[PDB]
Design a protein around this nucleic acid. Structure first.
Lengths: 143, 189, 126, 55, 72, 138
RNA sequence: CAGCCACCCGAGAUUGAGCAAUAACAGGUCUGUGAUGCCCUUAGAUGUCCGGGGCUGCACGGCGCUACACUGACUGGCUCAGCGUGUGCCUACCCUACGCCGGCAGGCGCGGGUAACCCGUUGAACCCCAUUCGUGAUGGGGAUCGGGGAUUGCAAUUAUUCCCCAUGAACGAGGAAUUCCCAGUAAGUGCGGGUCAUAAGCUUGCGUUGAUUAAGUCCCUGCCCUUUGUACACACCGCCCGU
């Protein structure tokens, strides 16, 4: 329950963005390595208590699921929630860390720009790579 | 006899107006243990004009066509109107429904003028059958106006719907539209 | 700088071992036309490959060769030869980097382009 | 040309592999139930074959 | 603004659940608990949990316009 | 034992197998008291138990109505209850008891037992549905 | 009287379609036709060969799509409510259960089915709704290209590729004007069939859905009848007058 001190409103855990107003399946999803079915499988394989709440969370719990995100090969599950899966720069599913160095961090997008990949050109805009018949098309990519 | 458990009774309804004997059918054999038993009033030669108040509440609330799909929901909301108004008032829900809709609602409701009218309305002596039925309609649409699309916690929205429909708070939009209708009715006077 | 790695999977390490076990790990797509067998209906592609790699080594635009085949891929030695569409109306000449193994967008040559768009104004309703 | 260039690939299945069994027309054919007619020939012969307008 | 909310059960969610809410003629905790400006849904959840101590099985939640107990 | 009254609402597939015992109705393995919808329970349990619990101990009925939809097997169970009781008290008690139990089961339900032939209606060409067409002409 | 409006021994008191007259159109079809009048003459003839490709050079004021929300949730709930196809006679090209490759497109294998007999008790909503809603940018997108690996068919380049993944262009039904709609209709969703070597956001049918209705009118757009006027009859998109 709440105690007469600071609630876990705004803190820097893993440089992610989350505010304590939306409930479960949304708070865990705020970190790009936790949420939905992957959260289900992690909570299963780690044998975790259902009652635990994220309202006053501990950093270790999110970190451990993130470590599982880095290395899900042993678990025999899709290493999903990664934009870097089977992509250049990782010999094996590796975790890149830190922010403010996005160009270096996501150099995958720089590799896609230097090869001028239309697929890569898709990222940065909201549109279909296939491009459907002339109609409400093109509107995909509004800034 | 037939009653509600060992704690509630349903034989406490006597208005004695001698005017609800031509449209509200209680005369001879229209009694039901059942709140609703799959009526076929459509196939009948307009034999649906002797309809009681509970079925009006049953059939006059849904917005658009976004509730139909299972009359399960209709009968369930009849049952839960029963129980929720019973919880609100501590007595027979239908009795207090009538009590709290008669003391308010349409005194002279919306009805046109002569052969064609849309500019203003006419302060019309509302017939007891149509006054009661349209007051239940007011409560139903106010329930789907207040309980639905509410900015507050919904377990007292029937209490505030009763407040808006009878006491006259400036919360429900239907009650201010009816206020404009009453302003026209007084324009007639 | 950075060389070519096969989509996060090592390539020089791939060539470290033998060659008979690479077909068991052959990449996705661009093998169907010759999937009927490493037999007839294939000699033309290898003939053009020898043609181009004799007139132009890798990392170079080839000499008058216009093959329309996807050039079933095993290694980024495909550079040094160009997939081109020949009609008298289609002529693409682009030097493409050797990062193409069984994967996306190794072909910049395009057989169509938008046609002259006229004036969109001059009224819209009457 | 007569038998040397053609007939070197499966192409026995296209729309040209069918034609109306009454007029040898390849447009608007009816494959359902196998009577294999066009629209208009079937409309002409429906009474005789056994199809009657009731719906 | 960024209104301050508490994600889980709270003392305010536990507040006055049996002190003056069930001692009124209208036994409905919704609006009265809402006056505390603390989430009323979890207040209802706490009230239901304390009502379902284990003597009578109350696991059904039903719709929003749902009944509450009589304890006056 | 043959009474030949059944219970059939809408198109639900029902069986009314009669042999002496307690009157129980099995729905998805859930008996009459504990019912599948779990929300229309009072509306079906009110007529029988308030008059007596041994009231159904006359002739047991296998009622296994494989009904899908709550309006389907709900009110089908009460149709079965009323029909079985009325037929048993008709054929195997006497005419006067017939009259009185028919009176109470008719004040239960005046006239809504049997309906007209109707269901979801057909679709016509020229439009997406039964009575609807393509783009509008204002 | 013909009939109409409501109901007191009482299952039933306007289901929806098919057919659909006389007289007409210079309405459409000679690119459905072994249903046919009036024709052409001489070289990569409209019929074989066209890797590539024809509307796709396109910004939801032509069918089928977003509910700013307890009427809504992911099986603690289904003994279910429910059109009609499916293989070799020309002709190889059908529907598929079940195991393995598998935690999966797709591939392999024996098996059933000429069909109420096999697909199949067709996965046509999950009603308590065991990740679980307070002032709702954030379950009402996730303004879609990365990933076990990507097709029984030469060609998948605006296209049958395929099983699925954090709020981010909309914000409360978005009006210049429009070959929609009244009792299981509108509108969600999906499932079939025709097209189909590959394929349906097309069309044609099929499913859980209502009434206290508006038991209305001729103000629009039209139609019908009567009277009436006409200088109209190519019939008001007429006739016609004058500079």
């Amino acid at each position: 329950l709440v105690i007469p001190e600071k609630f876990q409103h705004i803190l820097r855990v893993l440089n992610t963005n989350i505010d304590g107003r939306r409930k479960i399946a949304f708070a865990i999803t705020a970190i790009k390595g936790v949420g939905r079915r992957y959260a289900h499988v992690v909570l299963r394989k780690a044998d975790i208590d259902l009652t635990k709440r994220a309202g006053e969370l501990t950093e270790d719990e999110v970190e451990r699921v993130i470590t599982i995100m880095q290395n899900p090969r042993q678990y025999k599950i899709p290493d999903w929630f990664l934009n870097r899966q089977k992509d250049v720069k990782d010999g094996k599913y590796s975790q890149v860390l830190a922010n403010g160095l996005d160009n270096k961090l996501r150099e995958d997008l720089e590799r896609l720009k230097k090869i001028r990949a239309h697929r890569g050109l898709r990222h940065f805009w909201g549109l279909r790579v296939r491009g459907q018949h002339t109609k409400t098309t093109g509107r995909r990519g509004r800034t | 006899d037939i009653k509600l458990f060992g704690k509630w009774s349903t034989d406490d309804v006597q208005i004695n107006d001698i005017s609800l004997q031509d449209y509200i059918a209680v005369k001879e054999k229209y009694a039901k243990y059942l709140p609703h038993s799959a009526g076929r009033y459509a196939a009948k030669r307009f034999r649906k004009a002797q309809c009681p108040i509970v079925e009006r509440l049953t059939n006059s609330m849904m917005m658009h066509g976004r509730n139909n799909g299972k009359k399960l929901m209709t009968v369930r909301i009849v049952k839960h109107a029963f129980e929720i108004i019973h919880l609100l008032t501590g007595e027979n829900p239908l009795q207090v429904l009538v009590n709290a809709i008669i003391n308010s609602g349409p005194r002279e409701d919306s009805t046109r003028i002569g052969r064609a009218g849309t500019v203003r309305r006419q302060a019309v002596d509302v017939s007891p059958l149509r006054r009661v039925n349209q007051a239940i309609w007011l409560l139903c649409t106010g329930a789907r106006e207040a309980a639905f699309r509410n900015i507050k916690t919904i377990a007292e929205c029937l209490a505030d719907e009763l407040i808006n429909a009878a006491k006259g708070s400036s919360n429900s939009y239907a009650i201010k539209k009816k206020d404009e209708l009453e302003r026209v009715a007084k324009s007639n006077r | 700088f950075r060389k070519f790695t096969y989509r996060g999977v090592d390539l020089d390490q791939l060539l470290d071992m033998s060659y008979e076990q690479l077909m068991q790990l052959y990449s996705a797509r661009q093998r169907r036309r010759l999937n009927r067998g490493l037999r007839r209906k294939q000699h033309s592609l290898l003939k053009r490959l020898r043609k181009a790699k004799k007139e132009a080594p890798p990392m170079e635009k080839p000499e008058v060769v216009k093959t329309h085949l996807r050039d079933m891929i095993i290694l980024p030695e495909m550079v040094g030869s160009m997939v081109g569409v020949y009609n008298g109306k289609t002529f693409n000449q682009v030097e493409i980097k050797p990062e193409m193994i069984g994967h996306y967008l190794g072909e910049f040559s395009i057989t169509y382009k938008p046609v002259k768009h006229g004036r969109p104004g001059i009224g819209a309703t009457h | 040309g007569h038998q040397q260039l053609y007939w070197s690939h499966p192409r026995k299945f296209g729309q040209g592999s069918r034609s109306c069994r009454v007029c040898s027309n390849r447009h608007g054919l009816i494959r359902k139930y196998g009577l294999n007619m066009c629209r208009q020939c079937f409309r002409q012969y429906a009474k005789d074959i056994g199809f009657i307008k009731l719906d | 603004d960024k209104l301050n909310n508490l994600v889980l059960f709270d003392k305010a969610t536990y507040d006055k659940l049996c002190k003056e809410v069930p001692n009124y003629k209208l036994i409905t905790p919704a609006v009265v608990s809402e006056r505390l400006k603390i989430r009323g849904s979890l207040a209802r959840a706490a009230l239901q949990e304390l009502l379902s101590k284990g003597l009578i099985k109350l696991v059904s939640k039903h719709r929003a316009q749902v009944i509450y107990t009589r304890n006056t | 034992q043959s009474v030949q009254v059944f219970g059939r609402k809408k198109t639900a597939t029902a069986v009314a197998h009669c042999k002496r015992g307690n009157g129980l109705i099995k729905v998805n393995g859930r008996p009459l008291e504990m019912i599948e919808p779990r929300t229309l329970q009072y509306k079906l349990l009110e007529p029988v138990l308030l008059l007596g619990k041994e009231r159904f101990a006359g002739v047991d009925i296998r009622v296994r109505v494989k009904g899908g939809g709550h309006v389907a097997q709900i009110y089908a169970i009460r149709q079965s209850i009323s029909k079985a009781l009325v037929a048993y008290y008709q054929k195997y008690v006497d005419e006067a008891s017939k009259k009185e139990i028919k009176d109470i089961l008719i004040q239960y339900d005046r006239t809504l037992l049997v309906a007209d032939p109707r269901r979801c209606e057909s679709k016509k060409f020229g439009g997406p549905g039964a009575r609807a067409r393509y783009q509008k002409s204002y």
